[model samples]
Target: HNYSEAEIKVREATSNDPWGPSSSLMSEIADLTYNVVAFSEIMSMIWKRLNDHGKNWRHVYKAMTLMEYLIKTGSERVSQQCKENMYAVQTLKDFQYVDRDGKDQGVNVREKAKQLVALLRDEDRLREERAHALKTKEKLAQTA
Candidate 1:
């Protein structure tokens, strides 16, 4: 599987950005329980995309694989902010799990907050890696 070809295909397919999560999709996910089968479906989708595209899509495949691992192992620990971010990624409304008064209003707000912070840190790292990749790609392009 040539990763570059796959990447090109994926980029073209995503040019219109279809199949992303939306409000309806979020509502569906919210209604469903945190089940392994559901998570597996998400992983399968990413895997299928990677397989279809090959090496050109390696970066996307890697990202999807990382996301799959995160979802599989971190479901129980997922924060509200992460959930909301997921929703946002899908183009859905951001859901909140906390309320005023600092009391347990419902939903594990503290745990979610902790997870959210961790995710934010991870995102920063990811952003840095992506920036580095872009810079390298640019330099290579110039030399080529």
Candidate 2:
């Protein structure tokens, strides 16, 4: 598929240094904020990187970092897209990458994924509460 400029930016941003927060992450998130419409395709790319059969732990960690960054700072729309794809985010709970030499390569990856999933679940809970809270307010208005 022909990717958009924003999509390409995200790919490039998440391309390396899976260990610590990279320098380009914030700028890429800013780009994503500007191009909110590409959120779905961006998410697809992230999922692909994260699900790369554990062969490329570096990419997987970078993908997780990008995803976390997007959810945290990209845009409200980005977080909404993540909420819609919460099932896929939950899959990260089982994601692990261990080399044959007994080194765990994805400890932080798993941890961050869990935190991201929690945030998304909170978004769901808050949305449900908003719906119910609005209904209750309307009922109170009628009763009053």
Model 2, span 3-71: residue lDDT tens:
787667667766765345453554455446646476667777777777764657677777777776665
- My TM-score estimates for the predictions, one after another, are 0.25, 0.70
**Alpha carbon lDDT at 16, candidate 1:** 26
Off by over 4 Å in 1: 1-19, 30-33, 54-144
Q: In model 1, what are the clashing residue pairs, if there are any?
A: 2-55, 3-54, 3-55, 3-56, 3-57, 4-55, 4-56, 6-53, 7-57, 21-90
lDDT of 1: 0.36
Error at 135, model 2, angstroms: 34
